[PDB]
């Protein structure tokens, strides 16, 4: 199709052009390199093209051939391609401009050689290594390039071979490299000790870095290489970073543990290194924070790599340096460099040092006789941590599907996890010296007050640090410390000019007090003042203050709730009565979401009320305002659904339901009476909104779902489902859930779901039903059947046309099927056979998704289903099932196992396949599976035929040997998976060795 010149033009249009034409070239190129005959165009491209990018593509094409079809090729072509690639690498090395400027192309050619080595070496290329070593004397460019080759070979054999090769092949190549490494090392060491050319030496050290992943420690400790790494290559600038990476991996070697000589060697390389860094690089006093911000040359990477070396070496070897007093200054200087590195503004570098400091301060806490050696290090460390505390709480502001703006706290984020690590270190350090810690934080605060370090960032940061060490100081020292802090902040607020500045400091006062619940609970009067102050702030319109006030209110009551439900000395009533009574005034200026948070906080307190009559009473009072609104609007609006065309009425109703949701979330089981109060009218409301939504979507189609009208209605609908889901998930009295709640719930939601048009059906209905089945599915076998009848086929129809539409419904559907299958499998036994087939169909369809959230549940259902059937004895549903579906599951499982893109399901795919095989090889299936031949032989036959049909390039010997292994290994998960991995490698290529499947026994 495309001759050389035109290929050159396509490549240059793809890489250097743009827009539509760039895209059209892309398609030409992609088709070209996927052409199975493309590799004959390739040498020609390699011989004649004037375009390094064309040559890259030609090599990719040859890689596909090498990796997949090399053994189809005549031995002639193999040696020809090998001779061609070797000669081409040598030309590129011997051409200076190309060697300078086409390094990606040489690297690619080197990797292509390695792919050939994987096929050919050493069995059909025994002279490769001595030839390579020899050709390194011929040219400094070739020698350097030879180091790249050896580096990539090491990577492809040791670091990346798992899953890219059979277990047997990988072992052979590792043994082969091991046997010839003595000569590779000789070359490598000779270059390190003689070579001048920094680029050659850097390449050599890059290959050494990889060798250290696997070589025996004696190449390191019984040669002179440690001396060279720690002295010579630390002095010259260009080798510093790579040498530290090597020395990091030296520090991780497998070495003898009861050997004085080895210990001295280990101390010596670290001694050499740190001395050389001080002599040639920078003294311990250097400001690395400023050096790193400067970013000169490769300094950032060097400093990152130095942090890694120090923390790696010291985590392993600190006691070694502590064990002799002549090493004390090395010990301390190493720690002092770490202190300087810890000040660099780079979070990932900081975390790396923090992991080490954690190890250190724990060890000082648990062996405090050592503590005197590190006093100065620890003192500087308190300061570093305090100055780098990150925020412990983070909130996401998102717009949901009905267009509402919703705040949610982040959980388990990297930031949050760093806060937690910082805190742990700072807790240890606080106990190690509480006076020092106290002084540091007080004087830090004095420097906010005198203005010398004032800023929003610094006061927030200091507040997070102070708030992190609650429960460290002893109760009385804590009391005095906190009094001092709060007073200092109260003065600071008075002293600062402007509402912005005062709001920041005020928010930090509220933060610190929320973090010291022992201090708060000790004095009711103070606690009560805090709360009343937060209530004042709920009227403050300045940005963020109302959210701060509501967040602190709920945070404090989570911890101090008891104090709100009792009647305190000197008060006439429990404070919860006071809150409830002024609730309208207290919340009048809050946005709705904030009001809901407030109501949630109230419900936390009320759940603390031990007597039921009194708690119900409190609940009733709490809910008086939303119940008043409910009782005046909802029934009326539901009997004439033309009153809900008022967007203002829809809004008011949404907010009532969300108020209930908020209270239910915190009260759970204790919310029952309030739910009961609105339940029947709430379900009539659900029906009326769901009808209107479906009506309009039917008439207007999809775009009706984005309208302000339909969104407001869908909000009511989804909140109702949320309230019922939230209550059922926390219910304690399951009898009432079943006898009073479930039946109305199913009658209202199921038939409506089925009759709605596809674009009006809410996935939240499926979620709600999942919770119902999870919680009380064992108690409602008839309800579970209804659930299936109403939602099964109609949802399957939405999601079985393609893999991409109705993403929420896909996910919730298989979640619901899964729980029904676990908790009420009897519902599946009742289905008629044609619907059961649909169920099996649905399970297999989930297998085919490139969608981890569906796939996982599909696979889990299949496993669970097979166990359910296996638990029915020799009984006819079971035996019918096996005759009908055993092989459907065997081939479906195989189909996704051997697919390119269902790798996340691998573990469960393997388990399912082991279970299916055991059913036959453990003689657990009592019936024949075929229309006195055993099921064992019938299965082996089915499988040979399936495999030779799907993978016709496999030989009979490969199939016999795989199947023989599988059928022997099916009790041993790890070995079983290894065999499956070997199979997945062999199907990707021609001419796999059938003896690979004997790897487990050969062991």
């Amino acid at each position: 199709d495309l001759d050389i010149a035109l290929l050159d033009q396509v490549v240059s249009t793809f890489y250097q052009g743009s827009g539509v034409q760039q895209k059209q070239a892309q398609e030409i190129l992609t088709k070209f390199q996927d052409n199975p005959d493309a590799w004959q165009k390739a040498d020609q491209i390699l011989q004649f093209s004037t375009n390094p990018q064309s040559k890259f593509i030609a090599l990719s094409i040859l890689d596909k051939l090498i990796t997949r079809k090399w053994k189809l090729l005549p031995n002639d072509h193999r040696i020809g391609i090998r001779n061609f690639v070797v000669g081409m690498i040598i030309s590129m090395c011997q051409d200076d401009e190309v060697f300078k400027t086409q390094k990606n192309l040489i690297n690619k050619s080197d990797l292509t050689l390695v792919q050939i080595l994987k096929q050919e070496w050493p069995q059909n290329w025994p002279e490769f290594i001595p030839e390579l070593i020899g050709s390194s004397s011929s040219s400094v460019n070739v020698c350097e390039n030879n180091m790249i080759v050896l580096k990539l070979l090491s990577e492809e054999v040791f670091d990346f071979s798992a899953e890219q090769m059979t277990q047997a092949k990988a072992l052979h190549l590792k043994n082969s490299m091991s046997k010839e490494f003595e000569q590779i090392f000789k070359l490598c060491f000779q270059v390190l000790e003689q070579g001048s050319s920094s680029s050659l030496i850097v390449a050599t050290l890059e290959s050494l870095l990889r060798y250290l992943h696997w070589i025996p420690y004696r190449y390191i400790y019984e040669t002179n290489i440690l001396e060279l790494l720690s002295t010579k290559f630390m002095t010259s600038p260009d080798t510093r970073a790579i040498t530290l990476k090597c020395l990091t991996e030296v520090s991780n070697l497998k070495i003898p543990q009861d050997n004085d000589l080895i210990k001295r060697q280990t101390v010596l390389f670290f001694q050499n290194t740190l001395q050389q860094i001080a002599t040639s690089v920078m003294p311990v006093t250097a400001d690395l924070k400023a050096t790193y911000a400067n970013a000169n040359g490769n300094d950032q990477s060097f400093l990152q790599d130095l942090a890694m070396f120090l923390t790696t070496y010291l985590a392993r070897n600190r006691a070694l340096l502590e064990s002799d007093e002549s090493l004390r200054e090395l010990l301390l200087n190493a720690h002092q460099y770490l202190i300087q590195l810890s000040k660099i503004e780079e979070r990932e570098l900081f975390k790396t040092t923090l992991d080490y400091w954690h190890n250190l301060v724990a060890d000082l806490f648990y062996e405090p006789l050592k503590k005197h050696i590190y006093e100065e290090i620890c003192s500087q460390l308190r300061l570093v941590i305090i100055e780098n505390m990150v925020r412990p709480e983070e909130v996401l502001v998102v717009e949901n599907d009905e267009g509402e703006i919703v705040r949610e706290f982040v959980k388990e984020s990297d930031t949050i996890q760093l806060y937690k690590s910082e805190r742990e270190v700072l807790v240890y350090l606080t106990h190690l010296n509480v006076i020092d810690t106290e002084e540091i934080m007080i004087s830090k605060l004095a420097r906010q007050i005198d203005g010398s370090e004032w800023s929003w960032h610094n006061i927030n940061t200091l507040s997070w640090a102070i708030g992190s060490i609650s429960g460290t100081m002893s109760e009385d020292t804590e009391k005095r410390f906190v009094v001092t802090v709060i007073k200092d902040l109260l003065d600071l607020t008075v002293k600062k000019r402007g509402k912005d500045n005062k709001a920041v400091v005020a928010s930090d006062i509220m933060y610190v007090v929320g973090q010291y619940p022992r201090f708060l609970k000790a004095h009711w009067n103070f606690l009560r003042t805090v709360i009343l102050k937060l209530f004042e702030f709920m009227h403050e319109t300045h940005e963020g203050v109302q959210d701060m006030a509501c967040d602190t209110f709920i945070k404090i009551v989570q911890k101090c709730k008891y104090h709100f439900v009792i009647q305190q000395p000197r008060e006439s009533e429990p404070f919860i009565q006071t809150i409830i009574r002024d609730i309208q005034k207290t919340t009048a200026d809050l946005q709705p979401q904030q009001v809901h948070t407030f109501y949630k906080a109230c419900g936390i307190i009320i759940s603390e009320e031990r007597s039921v009559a009194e708690r119900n009473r409190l609940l009733s009072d709490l809910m008086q305002l939303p119940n008043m609104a409910w009782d005046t609007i909802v029934e009326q609006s539901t009997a004439n659904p033309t009153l809900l065309l008022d967007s203002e009425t829809v809004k008011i109703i949404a907010n009532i339901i969300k108020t209930n949701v908020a209270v239910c979330t915190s009260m759970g089981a204790d919310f029952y009476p309030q739910l009961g109060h609105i339940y029947y009218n709430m379900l009539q409301l659900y029906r009326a909104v769901s009808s209107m939504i479906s009506a309009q979507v039917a008439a207007e189609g999809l775009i009706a779902t984005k309208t302000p009208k339909v969104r407001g209605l869908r909000t009511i609908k989804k909140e109702i489902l949320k309230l019922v889901e939230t209550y059922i998930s926390k219910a304690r009295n399951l009898d009432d859930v079943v006898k009073v709640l479930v039946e109305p719930l199913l009658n209202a939601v199921l038939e409506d779901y089925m009759n709605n048009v596809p674009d009006a059906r809410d996935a939240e209905v499926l979620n709600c039903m999942t919770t119902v089945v999870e919680k009380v599915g064992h108690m409602i076998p008839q309800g579970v059947i209804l659930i299936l009848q109403s939602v099964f086929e109609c949802t399957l129809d939405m999601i079985n046309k393609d893999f991409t539409e109705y993403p929420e419904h896909r996910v919730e559907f298989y979640k619901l099927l899964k729980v029904i299958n676990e908790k009420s499998f009897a519902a599946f036994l009742e289905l008629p056979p044609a619907a059961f087939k649909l169920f099996v169909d649905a399970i297999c369809w989930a297998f085919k998704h490139n969608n981890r959230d569906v796939e996982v549940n599909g696979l889990q259902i299949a496993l669970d289903l097979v166990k359910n059937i296996e638990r029915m004895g020799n009984v006819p549903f079971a035996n019918e099932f096996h005759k009908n579906y055993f092989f459907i599951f065997v081939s479906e499982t195989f189909f996704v196992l051997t697919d390119s893109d269902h790798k996340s399901g691998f573990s469960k795919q393997a388990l399912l396949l082991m279970k299916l095989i055991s059913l036959v090889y453990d003689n657990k299936i009592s019936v024949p599976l075929y229309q006195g031949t055993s099921n064992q032989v019938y299965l082996s036959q089915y499988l040979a035929n399936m495999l030779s049909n799907a993978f016709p390039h496999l030989t009979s010997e490969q199939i016999a040997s795989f199947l023989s292994a599988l059928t022997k290994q099916y009790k041993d998960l790890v070995v079983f998976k290894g065999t499956l991995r070997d199979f997945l490698v062999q199907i990707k290529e021609v001419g796999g060795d059938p003896t690979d499947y004997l790897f487990a026994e050969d062991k």
Partner: peptide, 20 residues
């Protein structure tokens, strides 16, 4: 012990004053 001073001071916390 007690926290009577501190509670009274906190009750004075006022982001809208102009004592700067």
């Amino acid at each position: 012990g007690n926290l009577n001073e501190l509670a009274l001071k906190l009750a004075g916390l006022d982001i809208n004053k102009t004592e700067g």
